[PDB]
Amino acid sequence: QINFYKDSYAASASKQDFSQDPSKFTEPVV
Amino acid sequence: QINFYKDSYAASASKQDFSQDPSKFTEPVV
Amino acid sequence: QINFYKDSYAASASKQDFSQDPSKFTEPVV
Amino acid sequence: GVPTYLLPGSGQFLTTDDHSSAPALPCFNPTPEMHIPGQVRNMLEVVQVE
Amino acid sequence: GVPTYLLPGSGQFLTTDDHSSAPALPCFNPTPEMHIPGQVRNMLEVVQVESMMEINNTESAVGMERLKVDISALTDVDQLLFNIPLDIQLDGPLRNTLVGNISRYYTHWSGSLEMTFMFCGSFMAAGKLILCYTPPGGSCPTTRETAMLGTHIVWDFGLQSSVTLIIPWISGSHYRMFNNDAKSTNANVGYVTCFMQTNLIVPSESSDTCSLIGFIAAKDDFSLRLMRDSPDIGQLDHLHAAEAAYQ
Amino acid sequence: GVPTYLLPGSGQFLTTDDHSSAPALPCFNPTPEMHIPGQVRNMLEVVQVESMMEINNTESAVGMERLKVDISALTDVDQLLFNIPLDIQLDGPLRNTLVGNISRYYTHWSGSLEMTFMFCGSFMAAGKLILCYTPPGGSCPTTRETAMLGTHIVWDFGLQSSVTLIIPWISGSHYRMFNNDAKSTNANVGYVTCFMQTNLIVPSESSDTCSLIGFIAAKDDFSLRLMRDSPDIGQLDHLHAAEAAYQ
Amino acid sequence: GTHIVWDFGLQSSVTLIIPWISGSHYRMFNNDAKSTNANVGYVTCFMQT
Amino acid sequence: SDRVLQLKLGNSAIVTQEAANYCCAYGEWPNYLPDHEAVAIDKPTQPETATDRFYTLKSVKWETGSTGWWWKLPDALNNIGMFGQNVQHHYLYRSGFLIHVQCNATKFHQGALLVVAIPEHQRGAHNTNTSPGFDDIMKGEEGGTFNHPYVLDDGTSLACATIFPHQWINLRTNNSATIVLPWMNAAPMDFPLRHNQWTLAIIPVVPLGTRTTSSMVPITVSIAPMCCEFNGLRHAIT
Amino acid sequence: IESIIKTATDTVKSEINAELGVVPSLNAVETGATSNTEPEEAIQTRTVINQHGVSETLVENFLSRAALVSKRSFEYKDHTSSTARADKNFFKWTINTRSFVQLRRKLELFTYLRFDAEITILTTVAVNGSGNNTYVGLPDLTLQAMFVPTGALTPEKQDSFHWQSGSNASVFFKISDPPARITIPFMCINSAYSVFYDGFAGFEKNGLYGINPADTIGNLCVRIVNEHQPVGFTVTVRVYMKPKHIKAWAPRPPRTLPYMSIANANYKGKERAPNALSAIIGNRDSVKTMPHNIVN
Amino acid sequence: IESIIKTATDTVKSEINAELGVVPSLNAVETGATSNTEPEEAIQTRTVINQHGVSETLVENFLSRAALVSKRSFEYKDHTSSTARADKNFFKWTINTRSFVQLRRKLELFTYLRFDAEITILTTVAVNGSGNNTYVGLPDLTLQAMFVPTGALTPEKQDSFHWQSGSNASVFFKISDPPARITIPFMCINSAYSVFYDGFAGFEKNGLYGINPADTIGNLCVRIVNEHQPVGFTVTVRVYMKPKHIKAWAPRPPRTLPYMSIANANYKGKERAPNALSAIIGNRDSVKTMPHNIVN
Ligand SMILES: Cc1cc(CCCOc2c(C)cc(-c3noc(C(F)(F)F)n3)cc2C)on1
């Protein structure tokens, strides 16, 4: 949003990660 | 106006809808 | 960052000096 | 920082003010819009009915 | 300077606000990221994994005994074996499941479910069952003739030990709710019942009582919203050693 | 005007905040910069310089006597001369070193160390030593056979009066910590021991007791983080003349 | 040592390979079973279940 | 049968004629530590065939009142062979594990086993504020049994344990289970004597039953370390 | 299949199926895989264009929510005759996330977590009623919150030299001010925090079990900068923590039994169901009974 | 070698070494140079790509941290009958950086320093309890902080004409306001401050030793602008200084013995170790003893 801070971890939450791999828990077979 | 919020529903009132169809209540006949 | 002040010494800390010469204390020989 | 000063009317709650407020439920997805008959966009359409 | 004025909500601490705050440790370098197996980016991946249903939530069932349903050989046709209350939002067989646990953190849900049953008898015990889902509106069917009229799967024991019954999203409204009113039209999902399509036939050297294990999971259709506090955890006092953190 | 609202943390004084403040003396011209020898831009340059270890931190050692280790001629083989506790974060030989002093201003450290030993006997005193670093996990080795199994250097006295033992960064975690718990898995670094590889042989006109000086420094691998208040300086009252500054 | 875990099933037979692990380039008949040039090792069977 | 599989892993080998599949935890395979993730600058030792091989543990009897068994890794494999020697002589290790659980019966036998690899299975005690002790956690090659398999011995649920890499041994279907676990840890390497990355739990969700002549039905566990590395060589510490 | 999922998947219309050798509804739970049966394969379906978003279940949204992590009340007064057990105008707290059940249970759904913390401090004051004290009014005090990392000395008095904070990070805030707010980075010496630790902290056998030394944080010392006054007050400081920039690994079963301690995962359960040791879910009459049966 | 260092150096793999005429592990401490032996040359190493940043040890980060430099309490009341020794509603402080040990020791790690100062003033008030006074409440007062450079006259009363401050820099601030904050430039008449001065201030032999005249700053006079009230109060003013835009020269050994005075580097040490005159580091039984030995 604004983040006039010099450290990158001071930014706000990053709620834009829409990638997912459910098959690593649902089909973990070969 | 400003709306630095991440959610679109947080914006202000949208008072710019000037389209209207009164005939759906005044002439609802064929 | 912002620094709307007319004097340059009023600015914030300048934490971007990554140059160094340790050999002036570790190998000060010829 | 930015130098600022507050104006009269600062911190007062006008019931007709038009601003954006904090979204209390982040990332909420409203129900998809569906077509409903008889939409009203101006109150002058209602008065035109006898 | 810039002329400004404060709006309502100025200086108030909303626990769900999304801003940037002052970095307390300047120039701090976090540990480099390393690859760890099993990363989760959406909570809908967890609910998609199937977990055991506590169908045998009855007295005289203790611990693991509540996680299996025992079926014997009957001398009457068309007999009802068990039914499952489909109320995740209330205490029942679906409550302590991955899908149930993660969904009880939200208020509105939508999508389809899958209910898998694994037969855990001997190799040469045979049978046929019928698993039925009934959309809401009436009483839970008690007879096979009434139960077959809804969604169902006829399951024949064989090399594949498991069957799946899909509880499809058949809803009038666009989502559903936790209500605490199981009979509400916005919450009730219907019923699930099991009947004997045939009998359970086993030889003399096989145990005459066999067991089924039930699992439930969500499909890709599933969706949750309106996050809330889960009613599954509480606190009446301070935990042990909690005050020692101040000594 | 501009509509605004104040966030949490408004009007609060964080001592590590990085902003610009009002210049109290406008149009002031600072003195022109002139070149001065020995400029420091990172504190990691200082720790890279080697300083004496206080290995002889025992009673009956006074002042400079604590900065050297005396070695004589022995009549038994494989004898242990001394060991060095590798706990910078606790009081020990490494505490009052450049690397130790600068590191005690931080909480997390990483990287490799070098431990140099200078032999300060006569020209025609001879000997061979073995310096051993033992990664953590067990007790400090007391015999040469057990000590040789870790990292080590065999040092032969000669024209070069000094030897170096590298304490390489062998850590499970990605950094280490000051803990005050020396036995913690996140803090313990191992041990350093010295044994006789051979004896110290000197002629009749040479002193039969010779001295070693130990130094420690950090390499380019070294890194520090999570700055804190050094526990090496305190204050129980006002310093003398401090109140006179108000008179 | 070298081993194979054998599970009874449709295939009624299993094979254990005794590979050539010798120091010398050949081996000998000796009549001294304990000789270093003759001894080959042992084969044992245990219950895995 | 239902499926056949062979697992070589060194000078050992296992053949199964009645299997379902094998599970790769989170769909990943063991690998050696790359240079861009390394921490310790010491050159590691990679014994390979000496340590990357199946070790078989003592068998446990499958009775009617059985609550389940657990083995913590690498604790169970410590003190076993060259892997144990390398663990004792080194300060850090790193390894995946190929786990094979064996259990067979007749076609008149019924019973279901859940074989699950829990990462960081931190245990709890029952009806006490004191934490589990060293002897409660470190059981070695013999492992332990589940006090309350219903809650997994940690206040959670056994019903949701299928979120972890798992398989089933359904006597009616198969007689073996196989799970491939990569290196699971927040650190690239770790001290083997004070922390367990994985816990293999075998739980009798469906009890063993039959009406034919009774026989001892054991369960065998074989663990093969994979891509083992060791850093920090010094004297043996056990 | 790793892809970008922004909405729930759509449904496709299906027809009558009768084909030999294909049994989509039959599965094998023993393989450890969840059933792959589709609704299109179990029933005859229609085409539905699904527009439900999935942004609310994102781990960031799921966990990025301020929750109470600390709450401490102490008397702000003259502490000359008070025993050496009360907080004499200040307190120190060993930071942890296991004291309040809601945040603890939400965090314990994963094996590994990596995030920055957003710390908010909210202070309230009340006038002491002990004895014959009156309301008087509420003073506007200044509080100092200092973060002491591991190995650093912590203050022993309200006016000790430690409070000068040459290098320690301190925040000075008034009660009349908004709640104080700072951000702490990902402080772990590892790539992620260990929510659960199947190990011991030290190199000997008497160390703590289940607490990872790598995840040690330090102490938060909070004092009132003002000197005491003729009347006593009670000051309550609440600390809320909000994770952000979150990465999660290895989801775990949720805890069913009530928490017993912050140091361990010990369990005893409720006396009766639900959430009892022998019965997590409440009992019904039989497996053929539904409690909320619609009867008309 | 002067270069840009942003991360710690990487490690390279090495092999077995046996070569005549090359002895990397042998050094000569007498030359005054630190050993140049590399880990690759002492042991057999592997390739490590090191990603550790080094921005936290930068002299700017190391020193740019607000620290208490002044703390003064005085009575705000009617001072008609008070002696000519108390602060009568105001005080003056001769600015110095040697009164509080943490900042002093951090600054004294270098021989020369050049920086601008960021000054923050934090004021607290308490109701006097002497006699039979009650709480009453805390007034919102206005304070004036005036910087008087060398040679300028300082106020002698709380209402003297000096406070009109025609040219002197003053700041007026309320207690209810955030702490006051200003910036002072690098005021030295030289290119850098002298943290240590091996000289005398005057041209005669009775001058002060160790204080550089070039580094003289001046006085900070703080008064309460409000006139006294029927009840007395105690006002405490704290002054914090934060260096910025820092340049450092000639690093020095850290001080081991406790500071004795702000005027000099006099030393006496603790009675016993650690940090005693005869033993800086605590004693152990012998050079063959380690205290924290892991025994199992
Ligand atoms: C899991 C897990 C989560 C965390 C992070 C918790 C962070 O704890 C705190 C808190 C609660 C407060 C402060 C704090 N309070 O005040 C200040 C300051 F003002 F001094 F800056 N810092 C610092 C930390 C690290 O650690 N492990």
Ligand SMILES: Cc1cc(CCCOc2c(C)cc(-c3noc(C(F)(F)F)n3)cc2C)on1
């Ligand atoms: C070494 C070394 C470091 C320094 C710099 C210290 C600066 O001292 C001050 C302080 C503490 C406060 C003020 C000050 N307080 O208030 C005001 C104002 F409000 F009048 F502007 N100025 C001015 C100076 C130079 O000098 N030598």
